[PDB]
């Protein structure tokens, strides 16, 4: 579970992301797609070229979901209810892929926030993304 200290770290880091959330979401997707080509097969309907409108639009949605999570750190399972059903039931996303996007998000945040991305903050964000990932992979039928 996220500690109160972890929640503090997550909220402050996301505050630092500030107006760049959608931009970082898009960059994280791009880094996922280039580093881990297997993840591309989830988006056969996308133009995945650098700067594509679909990746940009999708980066913004992923970012908005992370924003929602950050505002709801005391109850992630409730906050991400619809998204969990979608990823686990409809899209059948392999749980390994959440680790790939999470790493891609940490790389992005590290790159843009190098003074804010201390080891403690890195550890809190990693737990946050893992917990989001746990929630989004927690639901079957």
């Amino acid at each position: 579970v996220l500690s109160a200290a972890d929640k503090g770290n997550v909220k402050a880091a996301w505050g630092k992301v500030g107006g760049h959330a959608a931009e970082y979401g898009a960059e994280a997707l791009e880094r996922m797609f280039l580093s881990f080509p297997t993840t591309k097969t989830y988006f056969p309907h996308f133009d995945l070229s650098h700067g594509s409108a679909q990746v940009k639009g999708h980066g913004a949605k992923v970012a908005a979901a992370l924003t929602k999570a950050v505002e709801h750190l005391d109850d992630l399972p409730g906050a991400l209810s619809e998204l969990s059903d979608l990823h686990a039931h409809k899209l059948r996303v392999d749980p390994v892929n959440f680790k790939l996007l999470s790493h891609s998000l940490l790389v992005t945040l590290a790159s843009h926030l190098p003074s804010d991305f201390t080891p403690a903050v890195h550890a809190s964000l990693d737990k946050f993304l893992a917990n989001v990932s746990t929630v989004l992979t927690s639901k079957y039928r």
Partner: protein, 145 residues
Amino acid sequence: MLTAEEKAAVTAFWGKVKVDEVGGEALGRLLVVYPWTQRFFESFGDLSTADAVMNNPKVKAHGKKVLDSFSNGMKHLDDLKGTFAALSELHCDKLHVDPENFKLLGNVLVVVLARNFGKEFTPVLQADFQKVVAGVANALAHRYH
């Protein structure tokens, strides 16, 4: 593994960057972010807090050696297997390190490179480094197979 283009990119980047504190940061971050990894480093002293870990002189010194090994790997990209065969047996059979951790460290290293190196560490260049660290991790896990 890497295209000639990817090898040229990785090699030019590694040539220019100042990395003498990178390895210590990467090892420090591993032990902070994945604290079970501390089990393997009892002889290093105070690892009781994030700050203690990061400023531990033994962590910093070991990390540099670990990066030295990675750089050696970078100079023999055609033969990561032969290059890490001896280290593979050491880590797997003597130190009892689960091979998942080789992947975790490679990925921490990538995060560290991104933190230290700004816009030049592009999605394309980072993906090349992912191939490198995946190769190092596979070579180290070999004595498992």
